[PDB]
Amino acid sequence: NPALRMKWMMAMKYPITADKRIMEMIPERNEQGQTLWSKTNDAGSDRVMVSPLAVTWWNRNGPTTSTVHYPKVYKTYFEKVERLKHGTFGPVHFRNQVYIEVLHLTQGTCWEQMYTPGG
Amino acid sequence: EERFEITGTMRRLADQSLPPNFSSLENFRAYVDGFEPNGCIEGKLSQMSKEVNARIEPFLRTTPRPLRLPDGPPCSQRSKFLLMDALALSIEDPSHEGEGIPLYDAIKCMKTFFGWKEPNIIKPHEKGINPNYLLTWKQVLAELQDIENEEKIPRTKNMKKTSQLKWALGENMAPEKVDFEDCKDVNDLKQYDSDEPEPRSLACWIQSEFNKACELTDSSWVELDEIGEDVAPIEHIASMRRNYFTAEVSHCRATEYIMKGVYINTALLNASCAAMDDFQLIPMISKRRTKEGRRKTNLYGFIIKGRSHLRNDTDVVNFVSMEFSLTDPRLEPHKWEKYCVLEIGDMLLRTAVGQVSRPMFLYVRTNGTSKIKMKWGMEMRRCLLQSLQQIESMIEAESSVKEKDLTKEFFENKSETWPIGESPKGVEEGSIGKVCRTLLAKSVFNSLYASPQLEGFSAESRKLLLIVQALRDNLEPGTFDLEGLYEAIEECLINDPWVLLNASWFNSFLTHALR
Amino acid sequence: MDVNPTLLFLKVPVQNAISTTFPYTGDPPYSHGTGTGYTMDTVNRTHKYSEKGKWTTNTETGAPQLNPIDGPLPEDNEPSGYAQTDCVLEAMAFLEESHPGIFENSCLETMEIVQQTRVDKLTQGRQTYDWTLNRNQPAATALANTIEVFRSNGLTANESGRLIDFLKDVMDSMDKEEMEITTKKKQRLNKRSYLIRALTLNTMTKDAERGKLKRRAIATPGMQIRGFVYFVEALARSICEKLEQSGLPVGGNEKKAKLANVVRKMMTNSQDTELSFTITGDNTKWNENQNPRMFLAMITYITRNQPEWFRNVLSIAPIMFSNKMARLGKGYMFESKSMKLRTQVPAEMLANIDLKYFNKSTREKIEKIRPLLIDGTASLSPGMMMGMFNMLSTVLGVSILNLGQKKYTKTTYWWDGLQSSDDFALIVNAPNHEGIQAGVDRFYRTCKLVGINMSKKKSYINRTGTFEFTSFFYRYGFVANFSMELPSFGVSGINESADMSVGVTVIKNNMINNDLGPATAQMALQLFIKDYRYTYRCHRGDTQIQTRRAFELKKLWEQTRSKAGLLVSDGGPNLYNIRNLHIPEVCLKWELMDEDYQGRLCNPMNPFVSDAVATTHSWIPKR
RNA sequence: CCCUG
RNA sequence: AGUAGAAACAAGGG
Ligand SMILES: [Mg+2]
């Protein structure tokens, strides 16, 4: 069972594996003294062991780059959220039993929800 | 283009896979090609005897009869932990630690009691060596006190492999493995004993257990996260249903059972998988929030886990469990067949009558569990889920007939009471909250007392339920063979007390329905 | 007062509260030990129902075989296996007549798929039986071993990468005089040994099964039979797709439509003085009464007027299945209590061994099955052990159902219904109760003529309007679905970003197919959120729970301006709901993140990296 | 003493 | 002892 395996793996100190250049960007110790990475090398490769505290440190302390391109390449996903935001809902009708994408919310076992997408 | 020729060996194989009185595959294909249907089925039906028929036996109000239950000594409790007799030593931890060491919590909970005394055995175990249990309890106390005399405080306590722990955890009981050539000439060489379970009759304690499982407490045992804001009306209705159910069911005892079992199984699995060749000690701890919103931590007892060299998903790991309680064992002794009970302390409670000095007993038992049972017990929370669905389904069904949701007519109406119990004066009707608690208790107990007999009984009794319902609907029911169904239903009532209770419930419902 | 949930049925009908009769929250039963006892019992029972057949000896494999086809007609209500060829062929002819052109179109589609298919399809499957190592292996490994062993000897007709070429190689190897295998060690098997190995099934007990008290034995085939079976199943599926009464291979959205359609068809046309009744029932010993010879006859009739190669490739599979062998299994275990010993007895020695060790039942089984054993396996010519032909039997049942039209019955009563492998439901219309009884008897007797047996213990008849079909409970137009077990909505255990999408998709799919309600979906979402947070330790930012990541999460929460844009992995709030279960998380809050925070989150030069969106959270854990 | 769950 | 139920665990190999 992978679920319990990862439950146990996350309890260790450095369950993540990263490259060697990480040592040049983020420091070995937090502002409180917590360790972020260790000198030990991975078996079979030159990777190093890293802790999730390194991930959080990078997210809150690290280089910034413009992400203008992201919406362009992931256009299909953003179109969905736009349509959902600009849609209009309606009353629920309990009766015997662009639209298919939201099929899990419109139809049901014995009820119908009125929906017209905002696009 | 395409060339697929049957060779000699395949031709010789296919020449023998034809109906009788046919010679070769080519002859069979020729016969099938030129076949035209004429009066074959009608003839064969004519030659058939008249004993092959399906007569329909009418079903009437006087036809069905109550099920038959087995006989023998009464059934005994067979759960991994006490349910109705549990007692907990409670403290407060205002520093909210996400996951701390439980040993220190156990010690801190222990240090709040000042009434210990010399233990003795009052209800013994007939088929076991009693003094070993007492020695085990004293050993655990001694180890807890030894924890103080150490340069550094440890996180886990590995018990010394003593004689009493060697016996209690069944050490060196497996026979020796050899080959068949050496030991062929032995007088007593056979295969294992493949017999059937020994029958037992129903007892009155399981009904009380279920009744107390459907009651309210003064604490909150479940805390759930948040979801987004509800914009669609369907989401408004869904949130209303969910919030009403959660409010009605969050103070129930079944939630306490769920959390207790989840914690115990998680601890057992982690200990078994980590320390394979050590006799680990694992306490039983739970967390609650009082009526004032103030946290509390409860301790129930201890377990000691032996060697855990598990290979398959059915290999067994043994352990010894000690629990606190106040239930005098000498009131329903047949319920405690496999327990050894000691009187270890004297507690004092405070109520309207003033202060009363009650005794405090300890239940000690050797048990075992597999990897699959522990894996399936770590996720008791789904019981809640199941219960909700049941309730919701009812409303959904009741809506389709009238083409209108009836959530408010079900929950807030404060009327429309459902017949949920039984009383000497007659059937008893309860509100919706009682119904929700009853369904949650049923799901929890289904998870606690799982067994193949329960599955068989449910599957084979569903059909009788539906037949009776059709009869109550004046649809003129009829059965091709009714006695076989009764035999199949009754073949599954052997040992489990839960299945016997369900059978008794079915008998009572059958009596009341046809009246 | 004594609580009693069963009494709840005194107010709400049973079909409204059927979910209370499913104990699907405990651990399902498992089996400890060997599946040899069940295998021997199954073989003996399969040979019991056909005791009045023809006995013969096989010239190639040398094992005895039994053939009950065209045997004496049944007399009593016990299960029977004597299927008449004339009746089966007549039923097939009438089914073809009722739906003109079905077989021709099915044959054309099957020929197309045969031409197009590829060998790689054999890789997708369950654990197959590997004859190179005499064990059970995953499909890919067994296929690789078999192809390597084939190439060891001169066999290079399957290099073209077509499944039919692989089957040609298999057939050629069957005719080879000797077979050499590598183990470094080498071994040689003569014609008979290889042939017996190629016609062998591996049997074992079935675990984690609900609704039954006693265990069962199921079998898996080798590698030389998989392709022919796949072709036959393709043909059967193509045939079934065009049949209105067939319950396969549809999902869970149109089954309710099928039930309502059948009921309305058998009610609306009825006059005001016509009686209608419904039978809900099962079939007994479905797998132990279907002779592969009848399947061969059906396949021969289906593929009339076709190229010879197509007929041969389609009809090979019944030939192999009619000459199959069953492996007894692991063996038995012996215990000496006096001297405290345990030992294992492999099945190979069951043929020649004293019977003083075993108890009554096992000794009787051994004595009964002894004449069949050959080279450590038992011949099982009659019956289908594991029923890989899950769709041809449905076609046969549907033909029998069709056989009851108003034209063929030639009497006042008539009937029609639904069939899905083992399960069936029937509706009979007649002017009196005598007509109803006559129709029921006619259906039962006609079914018996083909080898289909109706279970009288699990079947009942009532007035039409309410019934059940494959756990779909129909009552006055309302259908409830309970044929699927609810999963545990937990963490998959891959990454911080994979688990979120996986769990949300699982919830959405359960909501769509298995008819999960809204409130249950919300509660499942809450439980999964709790599990995710407690697994990855990414609690909220304002929550006062102490953890190793608490300091970093609190600092990040304090830094940000809009707290609603933080991912759940960075101690943000929860925004998902029923209407949002299809939008990926990163794209869900993109218009709510800060400039610098969202710049750092999707940094492409971060050391951690190298439905989902790439971010800083897609890392690879240690082995 | 080593290896394996 | 105990788990468990038609056959097994209650450690196996060198
Ligand atoms: Mg059915």
Author numbering:
A (entry chain C): 42 to 138, 227 to 248
B (entry chain A): 202 to 716
C (entry chain B): 1 to 183, 207 to 633, 658 to 670
From the paper:
The viral RNA dependent RNA polymerase (FluPol) is a key determinant of viral host-range and pathogenicity, and a prime target for antiviral drugs. It is a ~260 kDa heterotrimer composed of the subunits PB1 (polymerase basic protein 1), PB2 (polymerase basic protein 2) and PA (polymerase acidic protein). A direct interaction between FluPol and the disordered C-terminal domain (CTD) of the largest RNAP II subunit is essential for ‘cap-snatching’. We show that the CTD, jointly with ANP32, enhances FluPol replication activity and we demonstrate in structural studies that CTD-binding to the FluPol is consistent with replication activity.
Second-site mutations PA C489R and PB2 D253G were selected during passaging of the recombinant WSN virus with a PA K289A mutation and conferred elevated FluPol-binding to the CTD as well as to huANP32A (grey and blue bars). PA C489 is in close proximity to the phosphoserine binding site in CTD-binding site 2A. The mutation PA C489R could therefore plausibly compensate for the loss of the positive charge of PA K289A and rescue the interaction with the CTD. Indeed, structural analysis by cryo-EM of Zhejiang-H7N9 WT FluPol in the symmetric dimeric form and bearing the double mutation PA K289A + C489R confirms that C489R points towards the phosphoserine binding site, although at a slightly greater distance than K289. Despite this, the structure did not reveal CTD-binding to the Zhejiang-H7N9 PA K289A + C489R FluPol in this conformation. Therefore, we speculate that the fact that CTD-binding is not restored in vitro for Zhejiang-H7N9 PA K289A + C489R could be due to strain-specificities and/or to the presence of cellular factors that favour binding of the CTD to the PA K289A + C489R and are missing in the in vitro assay.
